Structures are given as C-alpha cells and as structure tokens.
Design an enzyme around this catalytic site. Structure first.
Site, short mmCIF file in Angstrom:
data_model
loop_
_atom_site.label_atom_id
_atom_site.label_comp_id
_atom_site.label_asym_id
_atom_site.label_seq_id
_atom_site.Cartn_x
_atom_site.Cartn_y
_atom_site.Cartn_z
N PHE A 1 0.83 -1.21 0.00
CA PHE A 1 0.00 0.00 0.00
C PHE A 1 0.86 1.25 0.00
CE2 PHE A 1 0.56 -1.61 4.33
CZ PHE A 1 0.90 -0.49 5.08
N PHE B 1 3.12 3.52 0.87
CA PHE B 1 4.21 3.66 1.86
C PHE B 1 4.30 2.57 2.96
CE2 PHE B 1 4.14 7.23 -0.64
CZ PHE B 1 3.30 8.26 -0.23
CU1 CUA Z 1 5.37 1.96 -3.16
CU2 CUA Z 1 7.20 3.57 -4.38
#
Ligand code: CUA
Ligand code: HAS
Ligand code: HEM
Ligand SMILES: [Cu+2]
Ligand SMILES: [Xe]
Ligand SMILES: [Xe]
Ligand SMILES: [Xe]
Ligand SMILES: [Xe]
Lengths: 166, 33, 554
Positions: free
Chosen positions: A84, A86
């Site tokens: 997702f 980060f």
């Molecule tokens: Cu996930 Cu760049």
C-alpha cells in the site's frame, strides 16, 4: 584502393554478422537453461487473477494480516502480501527455510514495486491484479523489501520486511 | 588498401564488453537464485 | 530576409531546434541535483530557494524526464528528419503544414507545462496509472505527440513528389533513412494514441472514474520502446551521412546503412515486453518470445559498430593512419563536430552491453528498477544522442542562420564535449555499481541517509559526476547563447551546402539496394509483426478489463 576497400569490408561484415548471431544464439541458449531450473520460479504467473482494489482489506485473503501466511502443500507456504501507499502488510512476513514460499501480492491504491534484496524476487504490483512469484531462500537471517516504482512523495521511504527462520 | 584491422579492434572491445557484462550478470542471478 | 523566402525551410527548422535546446536546458538543470542525490548528499533546499515553484524531488524528476527525453529529442527528430531529406532532395516541404506542426508542438508544450509547473502533475514521464495528473497535462502532451503525425505526412509528401519526378530510380540514402524512420514511428505511436483516446484523456475529464493499469502500461511500452529509437536514428542519420565527411573519409558501404535502418523498421515495435518482464498477467512464454526479438534488435546496432569503425579507419588512414592504432591519432580532434559523436560512440559501447543484459529475461530481475537502468540509458540518450546534437550545432547552426563560428567558440565547445562525456562516464560506473548493490531508482535516497551504507564507494562517483556535469552544462549554456546573440551574419554561409558524406559503391549493391526500396511491402511486414506479437496478448486483456480509481500521492 577504394574499390579494393569496399570489397574487403563487406567481406569481414558477412562474418561479423554470422558471429554475432551465433553469439546471440548462445545467449538464447543460456536463458532457456534458467527457465528450466529452480531459478525460473521468480517469473510471474501467466494467468489473469482480477481483484477489486476497494474491497481488498475488508473481505478476502488480504483483510486479516494474521491470516496472510497459509501452508498449502508438504513443503509449501502461501504468503498473501499487500503493498500500500508507503508500507507492506504483513510486517513482518515470517517464513521457514527449505520451504517453497509462493507470494501473492496486490495493492489497494497505486502501482508499487516488490524487490527483495539479495534475491531474484523483483516483481511489479498492480492494483486490480495479483502478482504470483515463487522462491526458496537458501540463506537464512534479516530480509528487507524495497519499493522500486514511484508511488508518491513518501516512496523513497517504503521499505518492507521478510523474516526467514533457521 | 588492406584489412580493416582497426575496425576489428573496435568490434572486439565491444565483444569483450558484452561478455563481461552479460556473463557477469549471469553470475549474480544464480548467486541470488 | 531573401534566404528565408526561397528556403523558408531553414527558418522553420531553427524554430524547431531553439524550442528543442531550450527544453534541454530547463530540463537538464535538475540533473546535477539528482546526481548528488545518489551520492547521498541532499542539495534540494538550495534549489527550493533558487526555484521557489519546485515542491518536491519528484516534480524535479518529472521535469527532468519530460523536458529532456520527450520534448528535447522529439523536437530534434522533427528538426533533422525533415530538413535533411529536404536538403538532399533540394525540395520545399509543404510550408503551411510545417508551421502547423511547429505551433502544435508549441501550443501543445505550453498547455502541458503549466500543470507540471503548478505541481498538478507530479507523475513522471511514464505517467503510469492510477496516478492521475491534471487534464491539461494529458491534452497538452497529446497535441505534442500528434504533431509528429503532421511531420510524417510532410516527409512522405516529399518522397511521393520525388518519386514523381524520377520514375524507377532508387530512393536517395538520407530520404530512405528519413522515410523508413517516420513509417516505423507511425506504427509505434499507435500504442500511445490508443492509450490516450481510450483511457488517459477520458479519465482526466472525469468521463470515466477508472483505468486498467495492466492495459495502460502494456499499450504504453508498445510506443515506449520504439520511441527510444525515434531518439537514436536522428543521431544515426548524422553519424552515417555526415560524420564520415567530418573525419576526412567516406561512408564505406551504402547498402549496409540501408539494411541497418530496414531492420529498425522491422524489429522496432514488437519487443515491448522486455520492459514488462516483472509484470503480472502476461504469459511467461510471450516474454521469452519478446526477449529473443530484442536480442535480434541488437543486430542493427552491432552492424553499425563495424560499418562506422571501418569508415573512421578509412578516414584516419587517408589523413595518414599508421599501424594498428595509428589512424586514431590522425583524425581531426580539433573540430567539436567530430569529437562529440565519436566520444559518445565510445560510451555507447558499455551502453549496449548493459542493454543486451536487460533483454535476457531472467537476468532482468537482477537489475530491474535499480540505479542500473539509468546507468544504461544515460550512456545512450544522454551521451550519444545529446553529444551528437551538441556537436551538430557546429555545422547545422551556421547553415541555418548564416552566423559563423569564432576560434574562442570552437574551443569552448571542445571542453564542454570532453566534460559532458567525462561526466557521463563517471556517473555510469556510479549507477551500474549501486544498481548491482540494490539501490532503487526513482527515489529521494539522500532523505534516507542510513538506507544504503554498503554503497559507500560508488556514491563517491555520483557526487563527483554531478559537479563535473554542472560545470559542463553551464559552459554549454554560455557557449550557445553567445552564438545566438551575436549580430555577426554572413548571408552566404547561410546558402552554402550541407557537408554530406560521399559513398563507396560496388557492383553487388544494385540487386540488394533494389530489394530494400520495396517500402510498401516491408511496412506491411512490420505491421504483421505487431499484430502477431501484440494482438494475441491485448485481446486477452481487453476481454477482462479491471479499472481502478484515480489517485494523487504528491
Ligand atoms: Cu510503493 Cu514507491
Ligand atoms: C536512446 C537510448 C536507448 C538506447 C539506444 C538503449 C539500449 C538498448 N536498450 Fe534500453 N533497455 C532495454 C533494451 C535495449 C537494447 C537491446 C539496447 C540497444 O538498442 C543498443 C545495443 C547496442 C550495441 C550492440 C552497441 C553498438 C555500439 C556502437 C554502434 C558503437 C561502436 C563504437 C565505435 C564505432 C567508436 C569508434 C571510435 C574510436 C575512437 C575508435 C531493456 C530490456 O530489454 C530495458 C529494461 C531495463 C529495466 O528492466 O528497466 C532498457 C532500459 C531503458 C530505459 C529506461 C526506461 C524506463 O524509464 O523505464 C530507456 C529510456 C532506454 C533506452 C535506450 N536503450 N532503455
Ligand atoms: C545534466 C546532466 C544530467 C545528469 C547529471 C543526469 C542525472 C540523472 C540521474 C541521477 C537520474 C536518476 C534520478 C532518479 O532515478 O531518481 C536521471 C534520470 C533521468 N534522466 Fe538524466 N541526467 C542528465 C541529463 C539528462 C539528459 C540530457 C537526458 C535525455 C536526453 C536525461 C534523461 C533522463 C531520464 C529519461 C530519467 C528518468 C526519468 C524518470 O524515471 O522519470 N537526463 N538523470
Ligand atoms: Cu526498450
Ligand atoms: Xe509534452
Ligand atoms: Xe498521443
Ligand atoms: Xe499522452
Ligand atoms: Xe519511454
């Protein structure tokens, strides 16, 4: 001279091309070999496996990260991974050696990368598609997952983890 | 005049460059395999 | 101006080049700041003070990408592969159309540059969905690429009109290169246009709330790989038909030059899957097919290596080439027009090896999306293509304006060219090194200093490169503007002929060359290669569409 030079060059050019091809056919040979060995696993599954990216963490395999790992054969274990914006689910992924781990990876948001440092596991993750790769780590210890496709302002910061046991 | 000896020199450098790269990369793949 | 009234083609060409080199400068300034980033130094607060509008590293990266790889090169091709065939045929391009293609590029450029400058389109030059930019980024870029479609029409018109006057004769060398260039490019641009008409454009106007990421990037790399050859062949046209003149020799084989460009019409488009070796939903056997075809597309470049090399040896020997390496010292290393492409061709040598590595399917997983990839194409687009472009200033720019070149300017450029080259070679070792050490590209890695500690020694090179290239870049800006600001004009060198290279011809040429001039047939071959390589795969994706909503993550 000049007409002597034209002939001499097209002579060594016919050979050069015969050599380059034969050298390319060696390159085609050695690739074929790597498609025959255990190492060929990291090549993604061919078949389309469609998913809804907006239902992914509400209903289905990717919803409960306590449920991501699932033994499925004698020496087989399926890990449902979720990349997702980060971050990676589950953090961390815990796995055993000598076992053949089959990853099934997807995204609820944007395209993410999945690159496991020190392995051949290098597959793109597309929202609305499950990416299916195979790998049996022989080396034990601390595995670090890296996002290698631009996914937002905090991309440089999206690291994951695979935890492998002795 | 004669044999494009110098051209053969340049393509050979290129032949060694492709071999050091390719075979070199064929190493790390199995060492990560 | 008189020059401008009987050859109005000269003025239109310059407006293509100016706009092209201006886009090189504005795009390149982000480079040094990016080179240091990979040397683990964070230079960007300095840049935020200089340029207030820059919001993030990745808005800097999108600008670097789009203004150099997309705008600079496409405006160079449009400048070269229209004018050169026009100067050999000594014919005028349909002028109304040529300016309509320039303004399209310029209106298309302004309209798209705003959303980039306004940070409404931090998406990079590949703009993979679901990362949704502002609607005026897409509309503007559409008009920008659709401009080449009018250029295609113009060169095909020049060709039709020449054939009309000399019935049964063989297509002249440069025109032949120009003609198979814009045909190939037309076959290529279809993947982009279809992405644009089907998905990207309706998306940003809201008509549709989603886009399938897998078809969007499958169609992209349809255009996505040949467009790198749409960059190269303008420099290849200049190395084949102009460099052997600048070196004091001849082109050693015309039919080899025609066969090199013929294979690029054949094996250009149906190889996109080498970019998608790490994508899902694509049969592994389809890739092993596209891996083999890409290795085949290495052949055209492998032939060029020997054809040019023998021509330079031919040149060096004529200037007094000694033993095995004696011809090398005999060349005209005093002329920047000669020094620029040659050096690039040296750096092209590690460039192609890196390339053939990435094509080998399974071996791609080793390097994919690491710093290695930029290490590869900087030795390609940023070295050979740009150096050729820079050198070419020293003959083309006199021929367009009538303004001559001083001895101060001739020397200033030589340094620029030696640095740029010396700067690109230092960087190459830097990224190839860190790429093998797992450093991902497309990342503000300075902002995570403790992430890549084992890349200590290549990080040194990256830091060193950014300094040398910043110096190289500035000197260039300085050298260029002086030429474009002098009121020095000799309207007679504005009328002097272009220094084309003469061709050594044999008896075995005729029957060969005659077969390759069957253009309409080879174009049909090229198209059925696309249908055979892409049709089966695209049909399976079209039946099972899976759109996902839009995102903005900047
Ligand atoms: Cu996930 Cu760049
Ligand atoms: C203009 C720039 C382009 C060049 C040309 C180039 C080269 C190759 N590439 Fe590439 N490329 C790939 C396939 C190839 C192959 C087979 C070669 C060929 O076109 C070139 C073969 C070259 C040779 C066989 C050498 C010929 C040498 C000559 C001709 C010089 C001889 C020297 C002389 C004569 C000098 C004599 C002088 C004296 C003084 C003696 C693949 C996969 O197969 C990837 C994916 C990597 C990944 O996973 O992301 C890739 C990555 C990229 C990217 C990154 C895309 C991104 O943002 O996602 C770009 C822009 C790019 C383009 C360019 N690429 N490439
Ligand atoms: C001024 C000298 C230049 C330097 C120092 C430089 C350096 C760099 C570096 C370090 C990167 C990697 C950044 C990252 O991946 O995060 C990069 C990206 C890139 N560069 Fe350059 N570059 C220069 C000029 C050019 C030129 C002239 C071109 C094209 C003709 C070019 C084309 C590209 C492209 C296409 C990318 C990747 C774009 C993307 O992935 O979004 N660069 N550059
Ligand atoms: Cu490519
Ligand atoms: Xe653009
Ligand atoms: Xe387009
Ligand atoms: Xe576009
Ligand atoms: Xe591209």
């Amino acid at each position: 001279d000049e007409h002597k030079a034209h002939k001499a060059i097209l002579a060594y050019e016919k050979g050069w091309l015969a050599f380059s091809l034969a050298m390319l056919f060696v390159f085609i040979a050695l690739i074929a070999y790597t498609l025959a060995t255990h190492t060929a696993g990291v090549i993604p599954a061919g078949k389309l496996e469609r998913v809804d990216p907006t239902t992914v963490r509400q209903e289905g395999p990717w919803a409960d990260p306590a449920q991501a790992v699932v033994q499925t054969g004698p020496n087989q274990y399926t890990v449902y991974v979720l990349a997702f914006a980060f971050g990676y689910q589950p953090n961390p992924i815990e796995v055993p050696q000598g076992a053949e781990i089959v990853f099934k990876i997807t995204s609820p948001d944007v395209i993410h990368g999945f690159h496991v440092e020190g392995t051949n596991i290098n597959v793109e993750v597309l929202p609305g598609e499950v990416s299916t790769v195979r790998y049996t780590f022989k080396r034990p210890g601390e595995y670090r997952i890296i996002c290698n496709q631009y996914c937002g302002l905090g991309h440089q910061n999206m690291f994951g983890t695979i935890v492998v046991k002795e | 005049e004669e044999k494009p000896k110098g051209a053969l020199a340049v393509i050979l450098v290129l032949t060694l460059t492709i071999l050091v790269f390719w075979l070199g990369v064929y190493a790390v793949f199995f060492a990560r395999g | 101006s008189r020059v401008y009234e009987a050859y109005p083609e000269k003025k239109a060409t310059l407006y293509f080049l100016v706009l092209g080199f201006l886009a090189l400068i504005v795009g390149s300034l982000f480079g040094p700041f990016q080179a240091l980033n990979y040397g683990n130094v964070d230079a960007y607060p300095l840049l935020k003070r200089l340029l207030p509008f820059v919001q993030s590293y990745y808005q800097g990266l999108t600008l670097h990408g789009v203004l150099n790889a997309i705008v600079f090169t496409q405006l160079f091709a449009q400048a070269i592969m229209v004018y050169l065939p026009a100067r050999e045929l000594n014919m005028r391009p349909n002028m109304g159309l040529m300016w309509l293609s320039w303004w399209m590029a310029f209106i298309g450029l302004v309209v798209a540059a705003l959303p980039l400058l306004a940070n409404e389109a931090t998406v990079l030059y590949t703009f993979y969905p679901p990362l949704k930019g502002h609607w005026a980024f897409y509309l503007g870029a559409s008009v920008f690429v659709l401009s080449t479609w009018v250029s295609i029409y113009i060169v095909l018109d020049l060709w039709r009109r020449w054939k009309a006057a000399n019935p049964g004769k063989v297509t002249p060398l440069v025109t032949y290169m120009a003609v198979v260039f814009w045909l190939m490019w037309f076959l290529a641009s279809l993947g982009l246009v279809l992405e644009a008409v089907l998905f990207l454009l309706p998306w940003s106007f809201g008509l549709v709330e989603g886009v399938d990421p897998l078809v969007a990037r499958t169609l992209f790399w349809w255009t996505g790989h040949p467009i790198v050859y749409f960059w190269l062949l303008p420099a290849y046209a200049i190395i084949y038909t102009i460099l052997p003149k600048q070196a004091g020799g001849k082109l050693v084989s015309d039919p080899m030059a025609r066969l090199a460009f013929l294979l690029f019409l054949l094996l250009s488009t149906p190889v996109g899957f080498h970019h998608q070796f790490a994508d899902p939903g694509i049969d592994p056997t389809w890739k092993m097919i596209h891996s083999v075809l890409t290795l085949f597309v290495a052949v055209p470049s492998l032939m060029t290596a020997f054809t040019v090399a023998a021509s330079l040896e031919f040149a060096g020997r004529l200037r007094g080439g000694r033993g095995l390496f004696g011809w090398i010292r005999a060349l005209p290393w005093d002329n920047p027009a000669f020094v620029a492409p040659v050096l690039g061709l040296l750096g092209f040598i590690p460039g192609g090896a890196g390339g053939i590595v990435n094509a080998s399917f399974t071996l791609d997983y080793v390097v994919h999306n690491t710093a290695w990839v930029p290490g590869h194409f900087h030795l390609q687009v940023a070295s050979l293509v740009t150096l050729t472009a820079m050198g070419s200033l020293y003959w083309l720019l006199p021929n367009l304006t009538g303004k001559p070149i001083s001895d101060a300017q001739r020397r200033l450029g030589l340094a620029v060219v030696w640095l740029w080259f010396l700067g690109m070679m230092i960087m190459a070792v830097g990224l190839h090194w860190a790429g093998l050490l797992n450093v991902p590209r497309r990342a503000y890695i300075a902002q995570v200093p403790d992430a890549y500690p084992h890349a200590a020694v290549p990080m040194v090179f990256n830091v060193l490169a950014g300094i040398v290239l910043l110096v190289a870049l500035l000197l260039f800006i300085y050298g260029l503007f002086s030429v474009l600001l002098s009121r020095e004009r000799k309207p007679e060198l504005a009328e002097a002929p272009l220094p084309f290279a003469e061709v050594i011809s044999g008896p075995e040429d005729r029957r060969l060359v005659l077969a390759m001039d069957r253009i309409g047939f080879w174009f049909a071959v090229a198209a059925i290669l696309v249908v055979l390589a892409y049709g089966p795969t695209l049909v399976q994706l079209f039946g099972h569409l899976n759109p996902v909503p839009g995102w903005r993550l900047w």
